[PDB]
Amino acid sequence: IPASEQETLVRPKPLLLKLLKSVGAQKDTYTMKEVLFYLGQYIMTKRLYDEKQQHIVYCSNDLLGDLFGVPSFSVKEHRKIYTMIYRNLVVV
Numbered sequence: 001i002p003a004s005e006q007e008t009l010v011r012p013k014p015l016l017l018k019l020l021k022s023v024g025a026q027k028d029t030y031t032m033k034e035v036l037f038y039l040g041q042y043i044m045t046k047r048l049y050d051e052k053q054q055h056i057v058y059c060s061n062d063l064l065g066d067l068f069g070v071p072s073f074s075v076k077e078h079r080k081i082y083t084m085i086y087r088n089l090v091v092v
């Protein structure tokens with residue numbers, strides 16, 4: 001992943017906007033740096049991820065699972081994560 005990806009400007013679709021508003025101030029347009037931070041905070045605050053979970057995020061009974069279309073995923077597959085995120089936003 002190039003560092004430049006973090007500067008991408010994005011407009012979240014409603015379901016992503018719903019999640020983002022649960023952990024941070026509502027903007028219409030974000031950087032990817034912002035979207036990633038807020039998703040990370042959503043995950044951690046809801047303890048969907050911990051050390052000794054084998055790098056797995058568990059999100060089956062959750063808004064995140066709806067967004068991502070998976071019951072769980074590895075925090076190690078960065079490319080796959082970006083893909084799951086982009087299906088819920090529009091680039092600016």
Ligand SMILES: Cc1cc(Cl)ccc1[C@H]1c2c(C(C)C)n[nH]c2C(=O)N1c1cccc(Cl)c1F
Nearest residue numbers: 036037039040041043044049075078079081082
């Ligand atoms: C920010 C974030 C968001 C989401 Cl959805 C998942 C993981 C993270 C985050 C993360 C965590 C906790 C915050 C859940 N633990 N390990 C990692 C990791 O590598 N992360 C990460 C950072 C930059 C780009 C990508 Cl692609 C990442 F997947």
